[PDB]
Swiss-Prot record, chain A:
GO MF terms held by the record: G protein activity; GDP binding; GTP binding; GTPase activity; myosin V binding; protein domain specific binding
A cellular component annotation (GO) from this entry: multivesicular body membrane
Keyword Chloroplast attached: no
Keywords: Acetylation, Disease variant, Disulfide bond, Endosome, Exocytosis, GTP-binding, Hydrolase, Lipoprotein, Lysosome, Membrane, Methylation, Nucleotide-binding, Phosphoprotein, Prenylation
Tissue: Found in all the examined tissues except in brain. Low expression was found in thymus, kidney, muscle and placenta. Detected in melanocytes, and in most tumor cell lines examined. Expressed in cytotoxic T-lymphocytes (CTL) and mast cells.
Natural source organism: Homo sapiens
Purpose of the protein: Small GTPase which cycles between active GTP-bound and inactive GDP-bound states. In its active state, binds to a variety of effector proteins to regulate homeostasis of late endocytic pathway, including endosomal positioning, maturation and secretion. Plays a role in cytotoxic granule exocytosis in lymphocytes. Required for both granule maturation and granule docking and priming at the immunologic synapse.
Parent-record interval covered: 6 to 188 of 221
Residues where GTP binds: 39-47, 93-97, 152-155, 182-184
Regulation affecting activity: Regulated by guanine nucleotide exchange factors (GEFs) which promote the exchange of bound GDP for free GTP, GTPase activating proteins (GAPs) which increase the GTP hydrolysis activity, and GDP dissociation inhibitors which inhibit the dissociation of the nucleotide from the GTPase. Activated by GEFs such as DENND10.
Record has Endoplasmic reticulum as a keyword: no
Short motif (Effector region): ranges: 61-69
Name of the protein this chain belongs to: Ras-related protein Rab-27A
Assigned EC number: 3.6.5.2
Length: 207, 211
């Protein structure tokens, strides 16, 4: 196992794309809103974002090469229903593998909120959630970052090992919203992401 | 071409840097001004920064483990017509220091988003490090998070006169072609270190007063 020139080139392409997007944002919809998905390798961060932006799902596992991001134009309505604000979403997608930890952690600063995933069929991924939350508290660029927790793969009921009460209890302990999602059939994907957007919007509207 | 992934000790070092950075940012003098030094491995980026902040120099080569930064509090005074040097301003400088080796290229490029300006070094004793400058500027155009970023070019190790290979004419011509200030520096004895960095700071500060 070694850092190949291809993989470094793929990452630099993501970074080239990211600077072009920020440069296009300088010459200036309402807001550009950035969040970041993180969690153990294989929990489904890439599939969750693909289902949200495209409504599609691939069953074949293509682990993320360090870092990638997607975009989506949505309308956001503040809370009673506010007038729709055009929002440009940048959806950062991080590799979960430990070898990418330093690289992905460098991108926490560009994130206004975090979509934290675990795998309802993989108990270690759920157990690691507190470590991920510690890492966010230590590395985000604001005390008490906004986080939405997703127990993903809710469509694999027979493979489920994380009991829903334990997840609700964990989330309640940290004061963070919890959704059970499926990237395969779309259940609760948009509800989780819209809740995260609502946290970011509500916070900005507080300053 | 078989670049190693980071070791646990390399990653532990880099994560400490990111932790220090997050704490610095969360505290938010009167201006946090950030720039980033880059260029080939061995040209003296780390040494130039340590001479600037501490007035010291170590002849031993301790190659940078991916990324680091140093800090300095300084007082900046604007420059106006008639040389009307304005009020002293408290500047908190964060000075990003990148590894030159290709193995670290994608990690170090992930920090361009935090730089307001760039200190670009070559080695006066190393022709190839100067020939690589055009590629470095190109990568800066492509990856900086503003158009035409402010750059100051440094030809470093001016104290090794017997070993100099880069002719002054080609460096000056290259800097003229790109519109960038050029200084010949020595991290060993300090010559032009503060001058090059203060010029970069002045470009950044003037840029802000325009916006
Ligand atoms: N049935 C089902 N499979 C899912 C779901 N989400 C992801 N998968 C599958 O689980 C695997 C991992 O998905 P993926 O999105 O690549 O995970 P990741 O979190 O991005 N991994 P990495 O951090 O390594 O890039 C893939 O084979 C994918 O098809 C889900 O909700 N249901
Ligand atoms: N005589 C002299 N030696 C210098 C000067 N600047 C650096 N050196 C020496 O040249 C070597 C490389 O310096 P260093 O600052 O580590 O270079 P670097 O650009 O940070 N390398 P890397 O990208 O691998 O971290 C060291 O042995 C250092 O002492 C200088 O101006 N004069
Ligand atoms: C934990 C981080 C947080 O609460 N907020 C936050 C705010 C802004 C940014 S940003 O760097 O992307 N930014 C906003 C407008 C341009 C730059 C990140 C996180
Ligand atoms: C090449 C970029 C430039 O000229 N100036 C510049 C201005 C501000 C910043 S920033 O680090 O404060 N920032 C905050 C969130 C995104 C950008 C960098 C560079
Ligand atoms: Mg992935
Ligand atoms: Mg160095």
């Amino acid at each position: 196992s070694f850092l190949t020139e291809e993989e470094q080139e793929a990452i630099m392409k993501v970074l080239q794309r990211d600077a072009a997007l920020k440069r296009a944002e300088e010459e200036r919809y309402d807001y550009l809103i950035k969040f970041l998905a993180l969690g153990d390798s294989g929990v489904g961060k890439t599939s969750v974002l693909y289902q949200y932006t495209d409504g599609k799902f691939n069953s074949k596992f293509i682990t993320t090469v360090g870092i990638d991001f997607r975009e989506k134009r949505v309308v956001y309505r503040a809370s009673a229903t506010g007038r729709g604000q055009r929002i440009h979403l940048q959806l950062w997608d991080t590799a979960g593998l430990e070898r990418f930890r330093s690289l992905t952690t460098a991108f926490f600063r560009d994130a206004m909120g975090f979509l934290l995933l675990f795998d309802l069929t993989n108990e270690q991924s759920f157990l690691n959630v507190r470590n991920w939350i510690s890492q966010l508290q230590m590395h985000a660029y604001c005390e008490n970052p906004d986080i939405v927790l997703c127990g993903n793969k809710s469509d694999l009921e027979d493979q489920r090992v994380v009991k829903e009460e334990e997840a609700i209890a964990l989330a309640e302990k940290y004061g963070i919203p919890y959704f059970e999602t499926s990237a395969a059939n779309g259940t609760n994907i948009s509800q989780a992401i819209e809740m995260l957007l609502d946290l970011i919007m509500k916070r900005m509207e507080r300053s």
